[model samples]
Target chain A: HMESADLRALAKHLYDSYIKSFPLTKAKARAILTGKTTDKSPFVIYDMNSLMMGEDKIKSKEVAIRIFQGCQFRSVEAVQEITEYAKSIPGFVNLDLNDQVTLLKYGVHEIIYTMLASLMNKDGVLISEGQGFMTREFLKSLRKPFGDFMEPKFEFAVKFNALELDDSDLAIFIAVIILSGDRPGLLNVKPIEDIQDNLLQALELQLKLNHPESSQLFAKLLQKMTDLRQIVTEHVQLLQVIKKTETDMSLHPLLQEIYKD
Target chain B: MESADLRALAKHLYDSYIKSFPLTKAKARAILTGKTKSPFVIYDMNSLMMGEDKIKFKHITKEVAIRIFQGCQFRSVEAVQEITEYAKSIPGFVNLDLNDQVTLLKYGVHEIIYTMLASLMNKDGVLISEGQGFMTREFLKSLRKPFGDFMEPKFEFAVKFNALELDDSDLAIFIAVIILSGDRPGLLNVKPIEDIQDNLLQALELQLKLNHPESSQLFAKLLQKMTDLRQIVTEHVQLLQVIKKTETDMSLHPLLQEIYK
Candidate 1:
């Protein structure tokens, strides 16, 4: 029978279910980014330069380690959430356990970045924890830094947000990205790719219904997926760079495994 | 396999398999738009559109539009062959189950076609064979009424995508990415296909890194086109669906119908 509509319905349901995990709504992000929010301290500065300026070299090492740990901790949490959602998608869990693990390892960061892009505004992304927002300018200003790494992602996020995709559109797009057929080591890609293709079909249909007047909106959204790929590719490079430069920083075992590949 | 062997294999696949169609940008645009200008016009829509007087140009007729659609189908088949052949050459691709191969080809052929289309395009429009002719944007828009605006978004995307100016090697790997995509529904051996894709991606990244050492973002930028290509193809399929519904007299090849569905 007709599976597209069913796929769309499932995508919609899944989107509704998982979107709650994404803390910043577009409106809230826009308000903060545009300085229209009532909160005076909208931006936080985790200035890495200040930490490096002190006389104690050991202090800087500790700070670097802590920053990397913080990043790994947040990313792992995101990976866990995304893994849970992937399991919930109809056919995702049916994949071979090793295939599922492979998909998660390679794909989770990209999904996290896509989610981050969806939540972003021109100024920056909202830090998921209670850490408020980190402005792009401050991120770029960090000393000899991982912020350099975060900068490209934030740059991509700002451009991605500029497309003006609503959460519904983003939800399906995120699902498509998560369920990608191209993830390395997938044991049986047909079902997963079928799920992705179905998701894509559903996403296109929803885009048509959602934005009747905007002819190129659907195309633009799909293009954003490629943008996510590029951003993540670069992010992976940065991950490797950090691993090479900061030998003592101690990347999470999972992070190390994913990046090394 | 060694990266060199993979690289040589990818190049051979590109030169022999991918380039088999040799549908230059202008030629494809002309074919899709039913254009007639220079002697190079392969699918002369003008011949079909000429009035009884043979002097004045008549509006496209239903028969002419169907012929144009057929022309598209004919070329699409070749393009699909090109991709399939290319897929066959990838180290692990031929190992996929026959059904998985068919499913991937059915769903992904259009994406690869559009990527080729983007490569053949220029800022003005698709260049006829070897740039002997040009298909103006306005002229192509005129055919929209006859054949349901299928080519418009593709034209728009090709123009933008061409701006990235990817060379042949990267484009070949990109085509491989499109073909080996595990996202098509019903893939039985996603892991092998994805492994091949991983090999292609690594080959691409290594090639891009060697070629464009100065530009850190070049690889990412190139990857972005894949997403763009996917979007354009999705729109193209959607338009085909519209054509099938509204133009009851216009019959699609069963294969195309399968593709759109």
Candidate 2:
């Protein structure tokens, strides 16, 4: 009963505690940190349909290498930002420190892809913190595992975009992912499960209050979580291919740490 | 016009809509007479064979089996009339461009039917002709080939939908939201339709709030039902196309052909 009380109380706390931390490219991060971010610099999204407008090809290997390296830079920031978002959720920080890393470690990819829906339209996605846009066309032309890895996330983002999630909805969604009892290497299970359940109920209440027409939004989002799991599994396999062909231009160590199984 | 007392608005339209209740159940009562213990048949296409088309036991003729199911098209016609009338009566619907209006109804009916069919459905089967008729999933499976596959997807969507226990008023607006879907292709008037859709969604949202204050997942869950509806419809079209091809002797009614395409 005491835990139940804490459950309901913490959920109420979570509704307004959400945040949107879009990821950033290295140059973009530098400019913002140095106070150079601008209106155009703010996050921007382009759908796949509009990407057809792009005739630009990545014909230069040097430029392609630089672009993907910066992407790793952006991806590393995604983990940090998601971690920051999870920390604010009540009880998340109370987990064992190693357990905390395990949750973030396992949970970050799901959170990253789920949040991508917010930055997407049916045909497009925003990357490099809105500092750049990649056409589905240009993305499709990228090499093997990279091409396959990039495309599945776009497929995911489109359906997820239909959910019409905003920052607050996503804030709780990320929290739910991070606190998952199913993640590998957890030190404690019961507390995480209890909190996750509380967050789900809280999510239900908040969705009703915020978007009533979405009567099945909670279930659909969970199904998306399930769908996302398959995408990641395939994505991980694609990543394995990247290592054998591991280019001279490397993903940042931070990403390499996470990318290695 | 934020939220715009759409509940009050939804209620106004709801009152007027009682007049538009389905043209099917009465006719379907007539259509189902010998349906039980019979193999499924293609309804309209067999009408082309109706003249002197008697196999007697028809057990001699698989073609005769195809002819018997042809009667199902009469009920099919009535369904289109009911949903089309239901769509036109909406506040902004008649004003939508004719092509856009047609596109909305053409693509949106199966989802609406399956969504409401949740009312008559249980896990095993669905009630037909307002419960005077019921078909077991097994019975429907006994249906000829692809037709056998049809009800299951709708049934699957239906049982989960039934779990939410939405009321008629809640559904009226939800169906309205379905028909006015901004997502349908071939819309020349995207902004206006979504404008109308957004308001109706809010109305349905408010109605859910009124109906399910204690049921935390109702609102989100209902919206997911609509998403599920789309998948069901897509699967339906796939099955229908194969059915059309497999039974070249059988024919889709002009109306079903138009809608399914």
Candidate 3:
């Protein structure tokens, strides 16, 4: 019988299997469970932003930069730079990657997946290091993006929001956003399953939280999925444009060849 | 430097430059083309089954029977005669050494990845064939004493419908299921792109007595990818469950452990 109890069992087993398979993430979870605290997040590494967006267009970049110039009073200075940059360049959209992930619209997870793709140069090799650090840091950062997107970055806050989603429905919906990204198939199931379980745990606590806050956060996830869907909807069309240009008289021989190839 | 209208410029680049939609399944297939082979599938004569409808009778011939005895060091008296008789019974089965075609009944299905225990091997076939060409309905009946009630076929379907959940094992299994069962749905953006790409060719063919005969063939392949993703998710879980049960109570075996791994 494909009973709900059986499915629930499968979910429990998944939670256990992941703990054993992904020891690093599990270790981080243990630390949190044990009342450990830290300055930086424990799950993310890079700063991601959609650089630009309009009626039906946006350009996203996954960046991991070392801020050499301004490390002191970072928030105050970070805001000034962010604001000035936006003003200086009309379409300047620079967001730290982890910040954009919680909502889902930025397709931050896909961006991270893409960054993993880029790390492998002409040949296939893992270019990034510090997997444990990145995992914990990224997970923490995703709780809030932008300067003040999240009032207080708490694991409970983030999970409380994800709980509002029906895991079954949300998992499939999340897959759509993931697949809609540039490289749809590259993502293996490990990360997805991990996220699904983690999100559910967060959702389980929703009933005890402030209704308004919980509602707002849940809306963010839906909004992100919707926005990502719109972006993918448009980009898929863009692929057609590239194909058509290739068939016609291609003015940029190199560009045409790239598309044709 | 900050005075320029970069947002407008960015929008121009997007509308005029980045967007494209694929015109045909061939084009979409081309995008998916890269050297990612089946990590666990065997290539030679030992393994049968290609995409989804794959299976094998463990004791197909005599030679394979002998190979199993030798491989197992003729540990059981039943092992020796079974292979000898089976080799004599099945044509060409005795021609080659058992080593030539000896394969683990357990095969790795890549369709829905993340499956921890998907491999399977027939233990009954191994013992009966080792007893020589003298396997009988009555003798075989003796072997089914303990787990006969649990031994219904279509076990895979039961597990899939009843067992799948939002857990790591289930999630991983889902990937493999989607691969095998997913129908190729219509591409959201394939229309305009196809219209544009085939526009010239379509015009060229309209002048001919019969339009290019291969158009139907091409369309068949393209249409396969657009089927229901949900169906694939459901059926895949069933397959994973079947594999798990077949290897029941054999946890001490290294091969069993590997299957789960």
Candidate 4:
């Protein structure tokens, strides 16, 4: 049935699902694409240095607590989001259960990281809804493993945010991310591979329609996608350390399970 | 760098050329975009066979070689179709004197196809598909020198060209650069052709500067790769003459017949 699935229709479904939550990023992304006035300071950036902390209004302990809580909030919502997104991808539901889980299992973190761009810019990420502006310096200032997490993510988020992909471009991208055949424990690689091929095919054409100005946009995004895997890998290792070091802090159980080293 | 039209060209090529063999597209894409999967699997052109079964090749005879050569002719038609669409998409290209259009396509098709052939290629062999299994470098070489020697330079060119790691966006402009070139003989509208080339030159340079920001030499090297590519096609045409005489009983597709004539 999926063999002849219309990728354009599929992209429409993906965009619809993605914008359900991050509708604002869709608007912000278009502003950038059209040379319209970009949403200036639309998302708050929390600077962690005490001098900037006066501006940020943070205790080092309070900063860590809110940021970690923000991670739980964002991370749990992502699991719910990606599952629906992955379920809708043509040929995914038909995949045998074990393989489907593995596909989601391996790719969710990277997908969340992609979604992370909509919530934050390069300088900082929005962790909690009300108190979401956590600066890079503060995340790093807490030191060691916590310090390392935001750097790699910011490194990726900045480059990716620069691409200015609207929800339409991202629909296929997330499909490509989740339906990845190369994930560690895939049972049915061929079908998953087939599905990925279809998603990427959709993506290739979508970028043309969406980012018509860029000659290198698709290639640039592909590089960003590949670069993201490295970021997730390193982020997971940092999570490995943080789990051990933090006594009271709690990682969402679902988030902890996905990032299992 | 009208990426809208260029992206259309890229999409047509993506769907027409690469879609038939999904994983080959994936592996080749990974290689070209530098995602790094060092082994390539062959594609089954007839069925949607992507299970990565072991591949076997036939021993070479005149007939077998002729059959293999015919497979290449089939791919060339796909090459011609995409190029025609791309040529038409250019503002000034179709308006050129009709003979200029034909000549531009005639000479340009060879250069453009081989330039794209870089994407389907890896170091070991070209990914020639449809009607037969994956032909190995050794098996192709088994066909005797001129025939064996036929694809050798192409493989060399594909390897080096592939190393440049160009994406379809980059190629869209390069193909324009190749097809719109005023280099062909008997060109009635050289100035008009040069104008097209002039516009493409700046776009390609700016794109390379953006994509390959680190290396100043990359721009010259791409032009150099283009030069080296022309030599390979020249050599390929010379081999076609030898094989045409050797397999006089076998007819070539009239499209290529018209172009090569």
Candidate 5:
């Protein structure tokens, strides 16, 4: 039933009529300025509810303003999952009932901000907890725009090189000793108690005995480690370069600016 | 004020007088077996809970579960961070609800089992979606005992290779690919997308390309495609010599089973 030219003519006429109308209708102006006298308070409503009821019913119209200002959006499901997670954590939740609102306010912001950062980086890794939810990426890809927050957390993974020793190995040896020892409890029992201490001690002794020979035999292994560190530093550094060059958006500043805008 | 004989206490009282005198007391009998009057149901319930569905849901499916699981099990902050890094990239991942934190620690095997089944071991390259933590020998060692799931994922890293900071799967692959392809992502691609597919594919094609190669990349690639890499690559290169010695069918193309397991 619709004709292309007819549709075009109608659109043009509507546009011209709007141009011709100099002042706002008194009713329209009143509605825009004060909202319906009978219904006020635009800030209390949710987006879906606002859509259902007119936006004018929303108190302060902050939600509408936020939408208009280009807030990065997430599906309700992702938001629900994230917020729920935040509310359940100790640092974020289970506070005094009065403070619950404040907790959720900041909690929601953190969840949303983290979720967006994760989603934006296509190649980033996700950090999950044992129960498998709290997902996050590696701090290695930092050095770009948002890199300031995501700093490189150095993890010197030192292995026992029967063939070599490095700074990491020294740290590892210290860790192993501390982890293997203990004290006694309610019955003057061992607090740091481990039943397998004997077995561990034996292994440590053997490892110590073979330390020199193993270190010599694995000399190339140590060199390999040095090479590995060099490669990783380069690789991570390279990743930083790639990440920065690929996207100019800085998460920290943009998030603050988004609220104001 | 409490006098306790520490030496005599070392004797396993729970294993001795109690379990040895079982069925003598109705209460003790009930304590061991549950309402069913048999331990079979208890074991069956345990196995059922440990089945793939529950494991996936409790661990791999959500980040909160992973965090709690690692928090409870991993002694080191660094170790817990390793698995968290992997959780981000797992497809169809579900974040954990706040209340799920306590449950994660309670369900240890569910988490570690899923991490192995759904995250890393299931894939070929050492690569998993890199989460927040670096994967070190010490980090890996944290997964090996009584406090948590004592399963070994059978992994290896080249010297100084710091794929720890890379996102999980990428971290593993970066380690594997560098060793296999003898090239890094930067050197291979010089760009994105194009290199992602090409570098991966080229590494996949290595078995056919290289002659008498010492690198595990080609085999690792084939193993990745066919899911047989773990079978071929043992924990140590020492195992490789034994496996290579026994594997007589060099003339035939590798089978799917041969590639993956």
Candidate 6:
């Protein structure tokens, strides 16, 4: 029953809090996995070429898995924190527990990707706490089919980044994706749909007022949901494939739960 | 496997679970000929009730839409149960936790239903039931103001997909693939589902080999159809969102509402 303005304010507040707590940039992630610190005027830039061709495929693969595992842990923690944020939202708190969990389960990955989209550039995105960035070409050079899987995400991130939505715009967009009433297995449809409708209306207002020059921005933003759906589908599919063939590698249990379809 | 082998498997599947449907022409003829009892009336109520030009006409149309969609939902639920049993017949599916079993079916049933819609449709439109017979594209579109625009795109997708000419064996495997989709969100044990999907994939490959020996690409094409079906369903859900927002007179059945939610 909150007003559109309240929703708009809440979207901004959530995005700011989310951005503050988001863990692991390129530098931090690299230091975590490699335990090496190189010269950094701005941030640590690992010599990825040396790492890739280090003449020890097993060790490099281990490093890659460790980096991926680190990202997974960070994502799990981020979602955990955001669940609290979502619960605190005006109407979201009143949802049935199962409904709440259903929204988080289906919505978190998209949320994580949307948050991470901020770090993306045309070349690649920062990783490991901004200490080192993984370029598309270098990522593709990794073994165990990891690169093939992540390439599409970076592909999507680049385009999404191009939209140039600031925190307020992104907040509303993320909320819309999160508060989606159309997720399967929800018990309370009308209220949830109402909440989402409120958000959508608020979003349309904000986009109209904020991005007046871009008349189609709101429609474009809505279209991104389909793109996000495709990306998440591919992400889950890739995880299933990896989890299947690479029995030796241990995926994070949270991810195991998340991707378990 | 030989074509005979593939046909035998397909026939077994179709005869067992896929038979839960509107009566086929031969079956309908038998029922009409008094050899069997019709489940319900199949008359075109539109002809009976149309041109009344009253407010109740809209009410009657709404009621008819609800009944028709409710019928679809019942058949869909029955189809889900049948698919669950079929999944159980596969060696690996039942090995997953019961929670996972329900999760997979809950997310998957719609995809299979929509996919099966293609089989039930032709150039005229989908056959709601043997009694009601073929619902034409034009007639369905005319109900748009009352029913909202959810049905047309679904019918359009079905008609186009029907062009694939997949036989019973191909469809049985396709439906199984849809059922055992490992990419669904909130799955508890994706690995086992992936294992089942792999088994189905192999079976589908072999069956395609036997069934479409001249076309080496048919297997890939069918797999791609799953992706297309997913996109179609996403679009369908988006339309539901629009209808939910703008169409006040529309009253979605609890089950249909649940699917959208």
- Candidate 1 vs candidate 2: which has greater DockQ? 1
lDDT of 3 by residue, A19-66 (tens): 332222323433433334663222322333321111113102222112
Q: Any runs in candidate 4 off by more than 4 Å, and if so which? A: A1-5, A21-24, A28-62, A130-132, B1-261
lDDT of candidate 4 over A93-176, digit per residue (tens): 999999988888888888888877765665566543323355676677764455566777787777687777877787778887
lDDT of 5 by residue, B117-174 (tens): 2232211222111221112233334431221222233332221122211123232322
Please give, for residues B1-261, the per-residue lDDT of candidate 3 as tens digits.
121332232233223211221112222222223232212232222332231133222422123222322222222223223323322332222343333223100111222211211111122211122122122122223323322222222233223322222222222212222222111232223223222222222222221212224232122111111222223433445544663576444333486345334
State each candidate's clash count: 15, 21, 68, 1, 65, 21
- lDDT score, candidate 5, position A242: 41
Q: How much lDDT does each candidate structure score? A: 0.64, 0.63, 0.27, 0.64, 0.28, 0.63
What is the descending DockQ order?
1, 2, 4, 6, 5, 3
Chain A TM-score relative to the true structure, per candidate: 0.82, 0.78, 0.26, 0.80, 0.20, 0.81
Best by TM-score: 2
Q: What CAPRI class is candidate 2?
A: incorrect
lDDT tens digits, residues B1-261, model 6?
355654565556556444544344344334434575333322355542532232122212256555454455556655666666766655567778898888888877778777766665655555544333445556666553536355677776775576556766577777776778665778887877866665566567677777787753456446545656778778766665775687655566576567634
**Which portions of model 5 show Cα errors greater than 4 Å?**
A1-261, B1-261
In model 2, state the lDDT of residue A122. 48
Candidate 3 — which residues are off by over 4 angstroms?
A1-234, A242-261, B1-43, B46-261
The interface root-mean-square deviations, each candidate in sequence, come to 13.1, 6.6, 18.4, 13.4, 20.4, 18.1
| Minimal lDDT window, size 10, model 1 chain B | B52-61
Candidate 4 chain A weakest ten by summed lDDT = A33-42
On lDDT, the candidate that comes out on top is: 4
Question: Candidate 1: lDDT of A214?
Answer: 57
List chain B TM-scores, each candidate.
0.75, 0.75, 0.20, 0.73, 0.20, 0.73
> Residue-wise lDDT of candidate 2 within B1-261, one digit each (tens)?
445577676886676556676423333323344443332332234322432353232211245435434433444455678889888888889998999999999888767767656665667655443334344566566656556666677776766676676666777787888888765767898878877876776677677877787765355556645546666666777776787778876755677557533
How well is each residue in A17-110 modelled by candidate 6, as lDDT tens digits?
Answer: 5455444432333344343444431232344655554324323358667667767787878778667657655688788889988888888888
What CAPRI-style quality would you assign to candidate 1? Answer: incorrect
- Highest DockQ, which number? 1
In Å, what is the interface RMSD of model 4?
13.4
For candidate 2, give the lDDT of residue A189.
83
Report residue A217 deviation for candidate 6 (angstroms). 0.5
